[PDB]
From Swiss-Prot:
Mutagenesis or variant effect for residue 165 to T: In P11; increases fluorescence at 475 nm excitation and at warmer temperatures such as 37 degrees Celsius. In Esmerald; leads to brighter fluorescence. In VisGreen; leads to brighter fluorescence
Effect noted on mutating residue 65 to M: In RSGFP4; increases fluorescence and shifts the major exitation peak to 489-490 nm
Variant or mutagenesis effect after changing residue 143 to C: In mut1.9; shifts fluorescence lifetime from 3.03 to 2.74 ns
Species the sequence originates in: Aequorea victoria (Water jellyfish)
Name recorded for this polypeptide: Green fluorescent protein
PTM notes: Contains a chromophore consisting of modified amino acid residues. Maturation of the chromophore requires nothing other than molecular oxygen.
Family, as annotated: Belongs to the GFP family.
GO biological process, one term: generation of precursor metabolites and energy
Length: 228
């Protein structure tokens, strides 16, 4: 049997992303469009800064900008919280601590609006150094592969994770971004609370050569792996 959640992701699904941000008082908005194909764990998205020049590096927003598109292998299907919460969706919240710098706090609602999977996000950043790696745009426009360990959060009826993102800097060092995450369902319907498992991410950042606005093109693959 294919679950109600699973069935919404069997083909290619349009994605809309909307982010309102404020970092050290610098307000900005970003809109993204593209498509997800969960069968292949595949996301393609193009993000546009709709208010001017982005005041933080595009790589710092990659994790913020739809884990329902992860590929869960057949043997792992009982651990897919994210699809099980659909179509009503889930709230994803994070704090992201940039080592020796500021932090982001994010809240997103991920849910269907008709046939479109929407990721609506608010982001607030505080305590950034005006000449640190973030406000000083010292990060390379690239992205490393990362594994994220997903744990059930029984009390909140959802999941949680903590993971470290490494953002490469041109002197060979990295800027660490320590993510703490909680997800909880929007509906009061049944969800899958998983056993501990990993999601394996790879992400590629590029540019649309014909786009004059400040923007990012993201290609991301996400696959679950178990602990058996």
């Amino acid at each position: 049997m294919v679950s109600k959640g699973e069935e919404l992701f069997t083909g290619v699904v349009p994605i809309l992303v909307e982010l309102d941000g404020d970092v050290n008082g610098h307000k900005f908005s970003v809109s993204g469009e593209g498509e997800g194909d969960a069968t292949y764990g595949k996301l393609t998205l193009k993000f546009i800064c709709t208010t001017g020049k982005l005041p933080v590096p595009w790589p710092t927003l990659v994790t913020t900008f739809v884990t329902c598109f992860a590929r869960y292998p057949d043997h792992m299907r009982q651990h897919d919280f994210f699809k099980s919460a659909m179509p009503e969706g889930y709230v994803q919240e994070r704090t992201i601590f940039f080592k020796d710098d500021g932090n982001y706090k994010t809240r997103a609602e991920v849910k269907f609006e008709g046939d479109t999977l929407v990721n609506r996000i608010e982001l607030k950043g505080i305590d950034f150094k005006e000449d640190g790696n973030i406000l000083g745009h010292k990060l390379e426009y690239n992205y490393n592969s990362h594994n994220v360990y997903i744990m059930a959060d029984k009390q909140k009826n959802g999941i949680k994770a903590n993971f470290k993102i490494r953002h490469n800097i041109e002197d060979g060092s990295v800027q660490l971004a320590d993510h703490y995450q909680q997800n909880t369902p929007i509906g009061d319907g049944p969800v899958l609370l998983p056993d501990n498992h990993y999601l394996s991410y790879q992400s590629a950042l590029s540019k649309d050569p014909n786009e004059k606005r400040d923007h990012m093109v993201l290609l991301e693959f996400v696959t679950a792996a178990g602990i058996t």
